[PDB]
Symmetry: D2
């Protein structure tokens, strides 16, 4: 639904969360 932003400290941590978020979005995309 709505969008939220999360501030993250550190490039490695950011990359980790970005990867996780993209994977969840790819998974969601499979049903619509």
């Amino acid at each position: 639904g709505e969008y939220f932003t999360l501030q993250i400290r550190g490039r490695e941590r950011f990359e980790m969360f970005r990867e996780l978020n993209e994977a969840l979005e790819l998974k969601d995309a499979q049903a619509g």
Copy 2:
């Protein structure tokens, strides 16, 4: 180090990532 922002879709997902991020920050805080 530097801060990054990540846009997340959905309140439940946002809450999940927020929880994870806070936990990592609490863990980091234990050595400084």
Copy 3:
């Protein structure tokens, strides 16, 4: 590559990690 097991406490936390792991695996599956 190799497989590792992680013991998790709590059904809700387990479900969260399972979801994340499945999403990453779905993402990986897209290139092979």
Copy 4:
């Protein structure tokens, strides 16, 4: 409560999940 195990593929992914799980457990430990 109860414990569950999750099979994970890849050492780097395993380490990432282990880190996340330990952080959540550290966070929980702060209220009991």
